[PDB]
Design a protein around this ligand. Sequence first.
Ligand SMILES: CC(=O)N[C@@H](Cc1ccc(N(C(=O)C(=O)O)c2ccccc2C(=O)O)c2ccccc12)C(=O)NCCCCCOc1cc2ccccc2cc1C(=O)O
Length: 282
Amino acid sequence: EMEKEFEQIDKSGSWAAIYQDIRHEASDFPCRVAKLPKNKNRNRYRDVSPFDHSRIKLHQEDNDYINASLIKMEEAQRSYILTQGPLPNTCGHFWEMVWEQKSRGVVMLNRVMEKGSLKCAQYWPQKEEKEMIFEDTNLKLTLISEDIKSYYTVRQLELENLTTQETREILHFHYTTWPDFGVPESPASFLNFLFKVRESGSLSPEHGPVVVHCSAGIGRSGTFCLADTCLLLMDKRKDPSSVDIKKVLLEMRKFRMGLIQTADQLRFSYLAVIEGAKFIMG
Ligand SMILES: CC(=O)N[C@@H](Cc1ccc(N(C(=O)C(=O)O)c2ccccc2C(=O)O)c2ccccc12)C(=O)NCCCCCOc1cc2ccccc2cc1C(=O)O
């Protein structure tokens, strides 16, 4: 089971210990392309890189690098592209990735500014009349509309390939209330956020994988993906309680390092899943 496991671990202050076990067991692969000197300014944090085997390649011939990994979950049949919050000089690359990968949705779990510093570039337009043009990748982005709510905001965007003049709609799911420190007391609003993302069909097979990111695209992003996959797995198995979340996290870490950066996020993950399963069946 996982239900009682949460009990044991929790009422034992075992979280910190487990997390470390995960860190210790996590896969270790080569990020050669990421550490090349010419890509130094394409990475936000020197200690957060994409494994070469699962990195996303840009379809340009100049430099196909971008700090982004493709988490491909075989059993749950779900794919996600986890990436770092774009840099002032990687916004064009970011949107080129969304286009080429035919993604339908972008999931953002942080604010442009947190703790007095920038955690992600303002990669999308804030006003309908002020559109953005990424000259280096020949892309145009326009804010069609947005729906601001209590703990999150959904925006409808129109991304256009200036080269072919082809337009495509993209949904921006911005969770705007993640706390300054630690994690949310309740996974409620986070769960509702995920469901809203599911409802849009952005996580579905007829589209390219969703693009998820916070600042490094491993911590909060990890909780998002992890919860989604674990929930989905519970929908597919005869015995839903057999879903071992550690096992799943470790499987995802084969595609990107660091997913879930603190014991808190690990606990929070357990919570959202557990509670999420309840809500679905009522
Ligand atoms: C130079 C510098 O400042 N680096 C920062 C970069 C950074 C990462 C995560 C954040 N975050 C996120 O959610 C996010 O944006 O993702 C948070 C982290 C902690 C708490 C809260 C948050 C939050 O935003 O809510 C950040 C938030 C703000 C600023 C910087 C954030 C950092 O902390 N590095 C530590 C190591 C992690 C990177 C690989 O780990 C590994 C690599 C391995 C490789 C191989 C094998 C085992 C390995 C094991 C590990 C491991 O330790 O698990």
